[PDB]
Amino acid sequence: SKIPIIFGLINSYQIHNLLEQHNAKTKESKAVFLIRDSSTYPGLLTISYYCQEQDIVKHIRFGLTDKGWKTAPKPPHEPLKSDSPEIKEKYTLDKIKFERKMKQFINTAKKLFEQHIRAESFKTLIMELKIHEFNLEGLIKPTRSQASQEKHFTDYV
Ligand SMILES: N[C@@H](Cc1ccc(OP(=O)(O)O)cc1)C(=O)O
Known about the structure:
This protein has 157 residues and is α+β, with helices and mostly antiparallel strands. The protein contains 3 helices and 4 strands; from the N terminus they run αββββαα.
């Protein structure tokens, strides 16, 4: 009857309210966090947490590699209406780079996501959270109705 510790596809409003409910805004950055299905890249996981320094929710994507869960390629900074041509020119190269890296990354991550549903992959997720310095005590646990339906996480309890 155990509930996975991974959230399914939850919306941005709900992400913010879950972090606030668990007092993320009176605790250090990453002391409170949740783990959820990536909405953009199926097979990836996204860690959402509160950044005290910028007063915003931030998100970090992880994917399966042969070594276990690892950080996914990070996208460039979003375009802004004030961007100079120099910013825009750099964005072009960085986006192409991100797209090529992410494509290779998901090609491997999605295959591992599919083959090993009965998985010792769970321990490597805990390892990568520790490397990122997420306080494991501050993990927000989904309720049954909000937990991920993906079979890879059935035993992520
Ligand atoms: N905000 C992140 C990118 C990001 C955005 C959304 C996100 O969630 P999802 O996987 O559901 O798209 C994860 C990561 C960054 O700029 O590095």
